[PDB]
Amino acid sequence: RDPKYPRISTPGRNKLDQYQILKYPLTTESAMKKIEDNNTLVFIVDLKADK
RNA sequence: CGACUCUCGGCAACGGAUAUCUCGGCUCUCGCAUCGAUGAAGAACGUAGCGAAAUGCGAUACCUGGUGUGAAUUGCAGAAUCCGUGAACCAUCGAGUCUUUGAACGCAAGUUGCGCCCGAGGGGCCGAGGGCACGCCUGCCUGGGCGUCACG
Ligand SMILES: [K+]
Ligand SMILES: [K+]
Ligand SMILES: [K+]
Ligand SMILES: [Mg+2]
Ligand SMILES: [Mg+2]
Structure with a gap:
């Protein structure tokens, strides 16, 4: 696939960054x-954060 | 005279009728024509300094932005703001964000289970992020069959 325009x-942006991973102690x-x-x-x- | 039963009245109970209401219902009339693979309707889970629901919103989460108005919101508390690019549980909308799903689309499904490809950025490794369903149309690329031929 070599598109003529990008779909996105x-x-x-990384919405699961370190501040979302580590909420509070x-x-x-x-x-x-x-x-x-x-x-x-x-x-x-976060629920989406793995080990 | 007393108890008991029945009865009449006064006061107190029990219960929620009646009366007066009503941001609801019902009926009629009018105007308008706007859902979705650019992911709808519906479903789930989250989200506030104090919230369970309803209402709102989506990791930018009872909201961001623009414009309008022009000094509130309030149950409690703290902050911000005032001859101002400026308060508001204000109005409105052109800028944004928009988790897991669902026609639901890599394969599944009483599973947050099982795969493949690309890839910023820091040979190999780690990547943020994103792709990979089915049918169909136009064009294109790679092909198959002596099916119809032509010349070698
Ligand atoms: K009586
Ligand atoms: K009444
Ligand atoms: K299985
Ligand atoms: Mg509300
Ligand atoms: Mg599915």
Whole structure:
């Protein structure tokens, strides 16, 4: 396919950027235990974000 | 005299009739002609400092932009703004955005399951982003058959 015009002309922007992936951290008592016991941060993340 | 039953009146209950209403209904008349593969109608999930629904909107998410008007919104709180490119849960619309779906279109489907191609940008690797259904029309490219021939 070598089209005579592009069907989409908008570049296409990454709407699932880092600010959508990392919404906010968890601050519950269980989540705070993970910080000093297992060097772990708990985050609320987007549903579309994989590991 | 007392209890019980029945009965008459006064006050208090129970219940929601009556009366007066009404941003609703019903009937009639008029004007207009505008949905969708440029993805509709419908369905799902999200979205507010405090929201569940209804209403609105779509990761730009009770809204962005333009224009108009011209000082509010308010249930609470905080911010912004005022002789101004300037408040508004204001009006209107030409600029935008518009998740998962659905005629629904890579293949499926009680699955966010199973594939292939291109590709900014940082040989290979990692990519943001995007393509790949069916029928049909015009043109085009690559082909098949001694089907009809011509010359070698
Ligand atoms: K009585
Ligand atoms: K009445
Ligand atoms: K399967
Ligand atoms: Mg509303
Ligand atoms: Mg489908």
